[PDB]
């Protein structure tokens, strides 16, 4: 009986998908690019500062049911997790931090600012909203720098009102375990619709893939490994069938293309890209189900005994970047040969989904739809 994260992995696949569905409801004509682990940790911890309700609430929006499993598991869970994917110290850039800002005139419970600090490694600042201007400079300045600069001036206007702001953020780069040729790219056409054409470098490379063309899915479905035990699915939906492939990804079909383990030849054309997603969460967690803590009903005694406190805004901003890069330190020097046949070809130039998997705990890291690579 020790504390494990085993436990709660899956329903963060189950989380990864509800959120995913639900953009993509609002909009197709937009790139969709999301933190499933990262979101989930952030509210998970704030959870802990909640009763009721509100509180019950929160877990549920993050598709956990407090029946299938006891509460306290579920935080123990968080808990663990974090301390894996917070400190992933290979050669994988992975920053990723929670801020909680709250109003001076508030009288704040210890417990509380223990775990967030102690438990969860997160921050918890005190600030005047009363100074609209220099309240966002702080948290501005609080992401640029564990960022280091990497994103810079996120809020762009505090409301007069704020009183509670939580922002979430993570930034991400990989090296792959077998790169590709700096030679080989070049500019191609991605084919955002019919009529709709955008220029972009599309890596490129001839050799064995962990690949396979699923028919329940209509999909060919690439799996990568970036050195760090972090695996990229990328999946490239038939003529038309964008929307299937929407609508059956479960976390029981991914289980099951990492079992795959057998490698096929052939030739992969993948753009070289930078995307970031920039969301409300309270106005996308809002659709989930997940309301009560953002409003005037809100109980948060957790943090504040007795004054009417509600979260006021919560931002979340991922960013991702792909390139050729594999090995540093030189050409470790690959063998590439010739095919027998014409090896299928799979081009990336056209919408696609991937989603980004720690091997390690089996959390998903990201989630996202290319629409249009240039659109970062
Ligand atoms: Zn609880
Ligand atoms: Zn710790
Ligand atoms: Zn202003
Ligand atoms: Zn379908
Ligand atoms: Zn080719």
Redesign the pocket.
């Known amino acids: 009986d020790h504390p494990t994260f085993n436990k709660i992995t899956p329903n963060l696949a189950e989380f990864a998908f509800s959120l995913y569905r639900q953009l993509a409801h609002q909009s197709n004509s937009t790139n969709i690019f999301f933190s499933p682990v990262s979101i989930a940790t952030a509210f998970a911890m704030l959870?802990?500062g909640?009763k009721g309700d509100t509180?019950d609430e929160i877990?549920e929006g993050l598709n956990f049911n407090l029946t299938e499993i006891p509460?306290?598991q579920?935080?123990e869970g968080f808990q663990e997790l974090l301390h894996t994917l917070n400190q992933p110290d290979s050669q994988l850039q992975l920053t990723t931090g929670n801020g909680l800002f709250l109003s001076e005139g508030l009288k704040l419970v210890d417990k509380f600012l223990e775990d967030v600090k102690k438990l969860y490694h997160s921050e918890a600042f005190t600030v005047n909203f009363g100074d609209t201007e220099e309240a966002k400079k702080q948290i501005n300045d609080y992401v640029e720098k564990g960022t280091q600069g990497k994103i810079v001036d996120l809020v762009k206007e505090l409301d007069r009102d704020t009183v509670f702001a939580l922002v979430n953020y993570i930034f991400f780069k990989g090296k792959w375990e077998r790169p590709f040729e700096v030679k080989d790219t070049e500019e191609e056409d991605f084919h955002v619709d019919q009529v709709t054409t955008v220029k972009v470098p599309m890596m490129k490379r001839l050799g064995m893939f962990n690949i396979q063309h699923c028919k329940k899915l209509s999909s060919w479905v690439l799996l990568m490994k970036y050195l760090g035990n972090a695996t990229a699915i990328f999946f490239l939906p038939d003529e038309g069938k964008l929307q299937h492939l929407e609508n059956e990804l479960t976390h029981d079909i991914i289980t099951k293309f990492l079992e795959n383990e057998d490698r096929r030849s052939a030739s992969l054309h993948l753009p070289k890209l930078s995307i970031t997603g920039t969301y409300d969460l309270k106005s996308v967690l809002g659709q989930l189900g997940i309301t009560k803590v953002f409003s005037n009903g809100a109980d948060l005694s957790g943090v504040t005994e007795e004054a009417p406190l509600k979260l006021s805004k919560a931002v979340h901003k991922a960013v991702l970047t792909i390139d050729e890069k594999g090995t540093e330190a030189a050409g470790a020097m690959f063998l590439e040969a010739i095919p027998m046949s014409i090896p299928p070809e799979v081009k990336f130039n056209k919408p696609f989904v991937f989603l980004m998997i720690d091997q390690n705990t089996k959390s998903p890291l990201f989630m996202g739809k290319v629409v249009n690579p240039t659109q970062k």
């Open positions: 959870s802990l909640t509180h877990l509460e306290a579920i935080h």
